[PDB]
Symmetry: D2
Subunit: 264 residues, 4 copies
């Protein structure tokens, strides 16, 4: 008999009954991923800094029968992250999936960007990934059931850009932090750690879309073999795949969500 089971294939993409902790939950990708986990049957614990926006999401999701909760925390603040994970464990008993979607950018040329401004991006966008991953991984180790970590980086983790010495250092570094975390955790504890590297969202560029003096929209479109800019919903499939049994062998990968921008 061929070495594949029907039970495996039918349920491999499931996240049903799993507890998914989503950071940057009020952001463009974070709110979409949080709802997608909910629609897929996971218990959703949303975190971010804006309580009013988290409350609005919790009300919308609960009206559709999604089991969800939220915790306010600055992801770069070690004490707040620890308390937030404790609140998730108190609510749901465990953490099975972590989706890291928070971040920050402020593009500026190196000559005009102070060391403090560069450090601000690194703390908000890079240190915060270490803090959240370290504390959630420790919780997954404590549980002894393995787990899944999905870090949203950027196609900027592999390609530089003018004005991006902060963001590219942060994302370039996070991709390697993910591969090193897989080396630290996957074999011993059954914790898969992967990143997704998306291109830009259409909605991020619509503001200057009608400006003939701007080349930004067309510079991206010339470099998108898929033929269009991304929507957050375009990455829910990859995120859920990397959060399910279907990706049990996959670890330390930096997954291409660029629509071909990285390979053309």
């Amino acid at each position: 008999m061929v070495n594949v089971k029907k039970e495996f294939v039918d349920n491999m993409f499931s996240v049903k009954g799993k507890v998914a902790l989503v950071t940057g939950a009020t952001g463009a990708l974070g709110c979409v991923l949080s709802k997608a986990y909910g629609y897929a049957g996971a218990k959703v614990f949303m975190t971010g800094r804006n309580e009013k926006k988290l409350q609005a999401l919790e009300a919308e999701f609960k009206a559709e029968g999604i089991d969800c909760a939220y915790g306010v925390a600055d992801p770069a603040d070690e004490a707040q992250v620890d308390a937030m994970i404790t609140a998730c464990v108190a609510q749901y008993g465990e953490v099975n999936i972590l989706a890291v979607t928070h971040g920050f950018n402020k593009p500026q040329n190196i000559l005009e960007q102070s060391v403090a401004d560069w450090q601000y991006i690194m703390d908000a966008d890079c240190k915060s990934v270490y803090v959240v991953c370290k504390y959630v991984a420790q919780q997954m180790v404590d549980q002894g059931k393995g787990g899944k970590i999905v870090v949203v980086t950027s196609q900027r983790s592999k390609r530089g850009m003018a004005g991006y010495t902060g963001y590219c250092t942060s994302k370039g570094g996070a991709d390697l932090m993910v591969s090193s975390m897989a080396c630290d955790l996957s074999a011993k504890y059954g914790i898969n750690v992967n990143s997704i590297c998306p291109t830009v969202f259409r909605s991020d560029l619509t503001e200057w879309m009608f400006d003939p003096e701007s080349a930004v929209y067309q510079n991206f479109l010339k470099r998108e073999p898929i033929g269009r800019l991304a929507e957050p919903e375009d990455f829910v499939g990859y995120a859920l795949f990397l959060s399910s049994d279907a990706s049990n062998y996959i670890t330390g990968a930096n997954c291409d969500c660029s629509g071909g921008y990285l390979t053309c």
Copy 2:
């Protein structure tokens, strides 16, 4: 309201009712992927050179209610591939998914490997990918409904190896052929083209596993953050993901199925 639909999330990983054409169908990965597509509800058209082995698979799958058929063809032979696609279209009406799993290798140092031996690997392992992709892409264009192509390459498409001047040229080339095919087809025709880059299967190395003189098994294990060698079933999730609506934005990618070998 958050921009993601429940109907999208519930059905995004489906391949139900789709016609999946699988090359190298009698091989270790090919038979597993063929059955996985069948268990997932796709109509499966298997192709390979060994009729007796294809007949055995068809009998096994039909006994489990899988709708499948086969066609004998040498994938490097345009005329045989063209006739094989015609037989798939006659049986099922169309081709929606293509999974390319066939191949050949015969490692040998460049000094001892004749130009004819190198060419034999290139024809069997590389030219055959161009032939199958070109003819199936043309059928998908003719249909006007888009489609999915998944080419199985190898982690050897990105890392060289002693004795692999044939296989590494073929796989390294196929990864770029996939990115270029996405540039040719995805925007205009809605045909996504991606590759998966697997590490070795545990069963491929079981022969010399007990020989202390061989370092092969341990060479790979030291370089596998996941902590074990692969089974064909470990790649069914990625292959089905890349064959479904869940990956509609993903094209021209060379997906890391190495278990961390590529990133450590």
Copy 3:
């Protein structure tokens, strides 16, 4: 005392008295590299298919005191390559450096490109690299003095492009063939094998430069952090570096000559 010698530093970039065999010697990069090796004091053996163009180069170089010779050969023809290397050995006693610059392209979409047209690119652009490298490496092994091989690929060895299923397969494959050849030859025989991955030459695009309907020139310029397209002379430094003692530790590398196109 610091572990570096003055004699080493003063002479590390030298190719003086070395025999450099350059393929595609009559082409834009080939003629420039051949003359640069000559100006740097190497004995230059030029090869290509056009005898009149090789004779013109030999006359120009000899008028400037360069020790050079030529041999006519189709680089994909195993018998002609063997005879050409024999003629170089008869003239100069040995081969120390090989620079592979020949090639062919004919861009065409996969749907319109016949299997025979794809194969034509592969034979002219990829098989020919295997033939030349195998025979020159065998000669270097026979000599027992090590050697240097520099293969000119393209930035297309790492990035796909519409119409390039032939060229990208050939260059993508050649980069991996180089890494595998380093695995086969460098430790045992002291033969370093590396590739250089250039961007396009300014002169290749000047024809359609005044056509407003063409985006080619600007598509490249937007993606060149260096701020201009390349001239063949821009790659002589990297080629000579990879042909000298200064790069003795460097092997199996695919060197970025893209002017930042690969990293932005």
Copy 4:
């Protein structure tokens, strides 16, 4: 006539009369690069934190007719870096080449590595690269004559490793910071910015070389197509190449100094 000049070829690798500022000058690679620039005729300005070790190097180099000087500075401290560059400008009139060789590592698994310990590596190894590059680039801009920046990263900038969540984030980030700096500076100001990615030095592993319980030495040797571990002198050629006219077109590159570790 072939488009290459003899005067260009004869002098392209020269750093004679150029002012080379070397950070981490007392380290294994820093002292070797500092002396190599000196032997090549550059004016050498060495910086580091250990005054006694800088004084010993200055005395050794002056005894061999090298024009050199030193300045004590912590490279992560903007005020000290600014004062150090002022002292280099006062001594030599300008800065033409910058070689960044300093760094820090303390491997530790993520579960046992505090956020403060991770931050310590990031400040010492990553923030310090931003500080030095920003201040030296500003000095090169002020001069208006262009310049060369060579950042020494590691093969760890592209491959993760157990215990390296700090170092891999720092090096992975620095490679992207270099590509982004090239986008910010090369076209407008003629400042090329590149990195070199070395493998480990033989001397770094000699301690546990005789311990059968340690796999480290053999783990690297199995992955070195060149056939041996590196010496600092093995990277002087690449560093001087990237500091000379021979590499004028090369910018934003992350150069492979791994001996094939990256490509096998």
